[PDB]
Write a structure and sequence with these properties.
Chains A, B: Its EC number is 4.1.1.-, 4.1.1.43, 4.1.1.72, 4.1.1.74. Chains A, B: One of its GO terms (molecular function) is indolepyruvate decarboxylase activity. Chains A, B: Its cofactor is Mg(2+); thiamine diphosphate. Chains A, B: Belongs to the TPP enzyme family. Chains A, B: Its main location: cytoplasm. 2 copies of one chain form a homodimer. With about 550 residues, chain A is an alpha/beta fold. Chain A has 3 domains: about 1-185, Thiamin diphosphate (ThDP)-binding fold, Pyr/PP domains (Rossmann fold, 3-Layer(aba) Sandwich); about 190-350, TPP-binding domain (Rossmann fold); about 350-555, Rossmann fold (3-Layer(aba) Sandwich). Helix content of chain A is about 35%, strand content about 15%. Chain A is built from 24 helices and 21 strands. In chain A, the strands form 4 sheets. Chain A has a 7-stranded mixed sheet, sandwiched between helices. Chain A has a 6-stranded parallel sheet with strand order 3-2-4-5-7-6, sandwiched between helices. In chain A, helix 1 runs parallel beside helix 7 (about 145-160) and helix 8 crosses helix 13. The longest helix of chain A is centred in the middle third of the chain and has 17 residues, at about 195-210. Chain A starts with a strand and ends with a helix. At the A-B interface, helix 2, helix 4, helix 6, helix 18 and helix 19 of A face helix 2, helix 4, helix 6, helix 17 and helix 18 of B. One magnesium ion (MG) binds near residues 443, 468 and 473 of chain A.
C-alpha cells in the first residue's frame, strides 16, 4: 500500500530503464542509498569521485537513454558540476539527485558541514540552475512523487540535466505505492498540426524538385533520438548521406550512399565538393561548434537548406518555432519515397584508400593508425575518443554499421572519456554482454580521471583502454608552445595502473610499430571482450592528424585576435 | 616602459609572496602561462586536475598567505569549484584566474568549445560569483592593472576567493611598467574610533573583574592572521588557553598555560569543566560548526563572552558591527598586562598521559596511534588530517610549538588533503626546505584525488603520506550502514602508487603493530625529509576515535529528525 519516497525514486528509475546509479555517498544521502538495494535490478556504481561519476552518468545516458547520479550536499554536487555542464552543452539527459540537509536542519539554519557557514541552504541549487533544464528542491511529501516524475520526464524528453534536491528526512517518509502503477509519460507532445503540415508539405516539394539533394547528420540526430528515422530517410530517398564529427556514428558508414565526414574546409576535397554542390541540404540536428566545423568554415553554395532541430524547424529563411523534428521526420517517411521517385542517383565520394602494406618495423604514426583502426572495429562497438589527437583522428576512422561513437566535440573536457567509458560499459553490459567498449584517450587526459579505472575493475567491466603515449599535451603543443613546460606531463607507468588498482583478470599491451599494431588487433583472442585491457600506444611527440594541425592554427589565431 | 598585462599579473603575485601558480593549461590561457617563465622566482605547478589544483592553492594559501590558481574557460573553472567553495567556507584567500575567450570571440558570440552552445559567455562567472568575495571580468586594458590589484588585495585582506577573468587577447597588450613601483595596499582600514574605544574599554574592565578568565582560539584566529597577537595575549595575561579542532595549531601546545582542545560535550571532562567554569571567555575567531562543537554542545555557564571576529566584535549580547579584531587585539596588548595584574593563576588541565608501554605485537588502534603521534612530530611541521577518522583523531595528538595544522572541519570535502599536501609542500619548501609536511589521509579519501601525488613527485617534494587502511569509509559506517556496500571501496595497492606515477627516489612502508609504528617513526633517517614517503597503516574496520563515535550518532540523528 505504501512505499518510502526513496524507494519510489528507484522504482521509477527502473521503469525508465536506468539500472545503474552513479555518485558517492555522504551523510545526507545514506538513507536514500539504502533503498537501491531494495529494488531488484538496481545497482550502485560506487564511483571514485563525483566528477568522474558525472562523466560516467553522461556516458551511460548516451548509450542507455538517460541516467542518474546521486551526490551529497555542497561537496558532492559542486564536484560534479563540470560533468553536468558538459551534459547540458551536449544535450545528454542526466538526472542529478542531491541528498540535502533535513527540513528541520535548514529551518534552524544549523551551521553544518558542507555549508558555506552562512546559513544559506539554497546557494548550490542556485548554481546548478544555470546548467539544468529545470530543478526541484523537495519540501513537501505530498507533491514529492509528482515532482520526481516531472524531473525524470524532463531529463529524458529534453535530453538535458535536471537537478533534484532531496532532504534526508523526507526520503524515509511514505507515499502511495499505487502511483507506480501508472507510468511516467516519456513522449514528446504532438506538434501544432497546421505548422507541422506546412513544414512537411514544403519539404516534400523541395525534394521533388531537387537534382542533387544531400543529407547531413549532426550531433542532435543522435542526441534527440532520430537515428532510426534518419536511417529510413536515407533508404527511401537514396540521397547521399554525410556525417559531422560530433554526429559520427549516427548514420551507418557501410551504407552504399554514405559519402563521408563533412567538416567544412577541413573535409577531404571530394567530400567538401559533394556536400557543397548540393541543390538541397537536409540538415539533421546541426550544432555548428568550432571544432565540429573547422572554425565555421561551411560554404554551402545553395540557400535551399532545411534545418531539422529538436525544438524547431527552419526552411531557407523561414523559422517554425516549436515544430519538433521527431514528428516531422516520422511523417515525412509516409510520402518521401514518392517525392524522391524521379531522383537519378549522384555518385558519392569513395572511401579513403586502405593503408598500403609496410614493413613490420614501421614506427606507428597517427594518420596510419586512424586509417587502420577500422579493421579492428565490429558492429555494435561503442567507440569513445578523447579531446586531443584522439577526437580529431577518429574522424578518419571508418566505422562498421551500428557503431555508437562518443566524442565531446563541443564541451571538450579532457578526462571525460575515462568516466564516460565506465558509464557506457555499464549500459552496454545491460543491453548485450557481447558489445565492446573501446576507448582512445591521451596520456595527458588520462591523468585527470585515472581513478575511475578502479570502478571498471570492481564491476568486472571489460573495456579496451587505448592510451596514446606521445609524452604530453600534443594538441596544445601545436596550438601554442611546442616546448613549453606547461604542455608537458609527469611520466606515468601506464601499464601498472590496472594492478595498482587491484585488477586480477586483465591484460596489458604496448604497441610501437605497425607490425605490433596488426599482430595485436587482428588476434582472435584479443577481439573477444573477455577481460579489461590496457594498450599503451607509443606515438611521436609532435604527430597529429592533419585536420587537428589545421584546426590548431585556426584556434590559436581566434584567441590571439585583437 | 611597458609590460604585457600577463607579465604584470605575475610580477604582482611575486610582490605578494605567491611563487607557485596552480592550475591546468587550455588554449584560452596558454599565452598567459608563457608569462610565468618571464618572472624570476615564479613556477607553474602543472597539476593533474583542476579540482586538485584548487585544493593545492588552498593548502598553499594556508601556509604562505594567499595563492593563485589559473584555469581555462568553462571546463577548467567548473572543475575547480568545489575547491573554491571550500576556500570560501573556511576563509582561505585563493585568487582564481580564468583564461577566457577573446573580446572579439565574445562580441561575435562564436559557438566555441567549452561553451554551453548558447552564446552566453557570462554563465561561469555568474556561477563563481556565488562563492567569491568579489569578481572581475576584464574588458578594458586601461583599467586592467587596477582591477588585478583590487582582486589581489581583496583575496588577501578578506581571506576569501576572488574570481578574475582574463580574455586571451588582452594578456598580450602592454601596460605601464611603472605601476609595479607602487605596492598593492595589503592592509585593513582603521576601525571606527568611538566603537573601537568602547569595545577596548569594556574588555579591559571585564578582564580586571575576572577570577577565572579563559582564552579560546578557534578557526579565525589562524585564518585572519591574529596568531601573533593571540600568543602575546596569552603571555601578558597568563590566562588558560584552549583551542578548538578547527583552530588547532593556532596556539602553541607546549606553553605552560595551554589547557587542551575544547569541543563542548565531546571534550575531555577536565577540559570541558575548565572552559565552562570560566567567568570570562575571550573567544578568538569562533566558527561554531557541527563537527567543531560536538553538534552545538557548548555549555558556557557565564554570560561574559567576548567574541573577537575578523569583521565585528560581540561582548555578551552587544554587537559592534565593523569593529575588526586585528586592531582590537593589537591595542588591547598595550594595557592588558595592567588589567590582568590581579589575576591569581588557575591550574590548567593536565596533558593526556603517554600510552602505557605494551608488547611489540600489539595491534595498532586509533586511540593509541593519535596519542603516540606526538612523539614523531617536531617544531615547524605542517600536519594535515583528512575528513574521516584522521580529522577526528588528530584532536587527540599533542603538537610541538610552531606546528601548522590543516583540518577542513567545516567544508569537509574528502580528497582535499592530497591537493592541500601538495600546496603546503610547495609553500613549506619556499619558507624553509627543512620543514616537514605530514599527511594523514583515509584509504577512501585518497581515491578521489590520488593523481596529485604525481605533481609531488615531479617537483621532488618530500611529504610523509600516511594512508589509513581500514578497508573503506569507517566514519560513514559509524553514522549509517556499517556493512552497506556504498561504504565499501575497491582495494588498491597503495604502496605501488609512487612508482606507478614515476617516482624514483622514495620509500614505502607498512605498519600494523605498536612495535612496527615505534620502530619506523623513531628511526633517525625516517625523521629526515630526504624523500617522499608513503606509509600504509593497517587499522580495524570499526575502530575510530571516541569523539567520532559520538559525533556520528549526533549527525545520524540530526539527518533523520522529522
Ligand atoms: C578539464 C580540462 N582542462 C583543460 C583542458 C585544455 N586541454 C585541451 S586538450 C588538452 C590536452 C590533451 O592532451 P592529451 O590527452 O595527451 O592528448 P594528445 O597528446 O593526444 O593531443 C588540454 C589540457 C580541457 N580541455 N579540459
Ligand atoms: C567530496 C566528498 N564526497 C563525499 C563525502 C562524504 N564523506 C565524508 S567522510 C567520507 C568517508 C571517508 O573515508 P576514509 O577516507 O576511508 O576515512 P576513514 O575510513 O578513516 O573514516 C565520505 C565519503 C565528502 N565529505 N566529500
Ligand atoms: Mg598526449
Ligand atoms: Mg577508510
Amino acid at each position: 500500500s505504501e512505499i518510502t519516497l526513496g524507494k519510489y525514486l528507484f522504482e521509477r528509475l527502473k521503469q525508465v530503464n536506468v539500472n545503474t546509479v552513479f555518485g558517492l555517498p555522504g551523510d545526507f544521502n545514506l538513507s536514500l542509498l539504502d533503498k537501491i538495494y531494495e529494488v531488484e535490478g538496481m545497482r550502485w556504481a560506487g564511483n571514485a569521485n563525483e566528477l568522474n561519476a558525472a562523466y560516467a552518468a553522461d556516458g551511460y545516458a548516451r548509450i542507455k537513454g538517460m541516467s542518474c547520479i546521486i551526490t551529497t550536499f555542497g561537496v558532492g554536487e559542486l564536484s560534479a558540476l563540470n560533468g553536468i555542464a558538459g551534459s547540458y552543452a551536449e544535450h545528454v539527459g542526466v538526472l542529478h539527485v542531491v541528498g540535502v540537509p533535513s527540513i528541520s536542519a535548514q529551518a534552524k539554519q544549523l551551521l553544518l558541514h558542507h555549508t558555506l557557514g552562512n546559513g544559506d541552504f539554497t546557494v548550490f541549487h542556485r548554481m546548478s540552475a544555470n546548467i539544468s533544464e529545470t530543478t526541484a528542491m523537495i519540501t513537501d511529501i505530498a507533491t514529492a512523487p509528482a515532482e520526481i516524475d516531472r524531473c525524470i520526464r524532463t531529463t529524458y524528453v529534453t535530453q538535458r540535466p535536471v537537478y533534484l534536491g532531496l532532504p534526508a528526512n523526507l526520503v524515509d517518509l511514505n507515499v502511495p505505492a499505487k502511483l507506480l502503477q501508472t507510468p511516467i509519460d516519456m513522449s514528446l507532445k504532438p506538434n501544432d498540426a497546421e505548422s507541422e503540415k506546412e513544414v512537411i508539405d514544403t519539404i516534400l516539394v523541395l525534394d521533388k524538385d531537387a537534382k542533387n539533394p544531400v543529407i547531413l547528420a549532426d550531433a542532435c540526430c543522435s542526441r534527440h533520438d532520430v537515428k532510426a528515422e534518419t536511417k529510413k530517410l536515407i533508404d527511401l530517398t537514396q540521397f547521399p548521406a554525410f556525417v559531422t564529427p560530433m554526429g559520427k556514428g549516427s548514420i551507418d558508414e557501410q551504407h552504399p550512399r554514405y559519402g563521408g565526414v563533412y567538416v567544412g574546409t577541413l573535409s577531404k576535397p571530394e567530400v567538401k565538393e559533394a556536400v557543397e554542390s548540393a541543390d538541397l541540404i537536409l540538415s539533421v540536428g546541426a550544432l555548428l561548434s568550432d571544432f565540429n566545423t573547422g572554425s565555421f568554415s561551411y560554404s554551402y553554395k545553395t540557400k535551399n537548406i532545411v534545418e531539422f532541430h529538436s525544438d524547431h524547424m527552419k526552411i531557407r529563411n523561414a523559422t517554425f518555432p516549436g515544430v519538433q523534428m521527431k514528428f516531422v521526420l516520422q511523417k515525412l517517411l509516409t510520402t518521401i519515397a514518392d517525392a524522391a521517385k524521379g531522383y537519378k542517383p549522384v555518385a558519392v565520394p569513395a572511401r579513403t584508400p586502405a593503408n598500403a602494406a609496410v614493413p613490420a618495423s614501421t614506427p606507428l604514426k597517427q594518420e596510419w593508425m586512424w586509417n587502420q583502426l577500422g579493421n579492428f572495429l565490429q558492429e555494435g562497438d561503442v567507440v569513445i575518443a578523447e579531446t586531443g589527437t584522439s577526437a580529431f583522428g577518429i574522424n578518419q576512422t571508418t566505422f562498421p554499421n551500428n557503431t555508437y561513437g562518443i566524442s565531446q566535440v563541443l564541451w571538450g573536457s579532457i578526462g571525460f572519456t575515462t568516466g564516460a567509458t565506465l558509464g557506457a560499459a555499464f549500459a552496454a553490459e545491460e543491453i548485450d554482454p557481447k558489445k565492446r567498449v573501446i576507448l582512445f584517450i591521451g596520456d595527458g587526459s588520462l591523468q585527470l580521471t585515472v581513478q575511475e579505472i578502479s570502478t571498471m575493475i570492481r564491476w568486472g567491466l571489460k573495456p579496451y583502454l587505448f592510451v596514446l603515449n606521445n609524452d604530453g599535451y600534443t594538441i596544445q603543443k601545436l596550438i601554442h608552445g611546442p616546448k613549453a613546460q606547461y604542455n608537458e606531463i609527469q611520466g606515468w607507468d601506464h601499464l601498472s595502473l590496472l594492478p595498482t588498482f587491484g585488477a586480477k583478470d586483465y591484460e596489458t599491451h604496448r604497441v610501437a610499430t605497425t607490425g605490433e599494431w596488426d599482430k595485436l588487433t587482428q588476434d582472435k583472442s584479443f577481439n573477444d571482450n573477455s577481460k579489461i585491457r590496457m594498450i599503451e600506444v607509443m606515438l611521436p611527440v609532435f604527430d597529429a592528424p592533419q585536420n587537428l594541425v589545421e584546426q590548431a592554427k585556426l584556434t590559436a589565431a581566434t584567441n590571439a585576435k585583437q
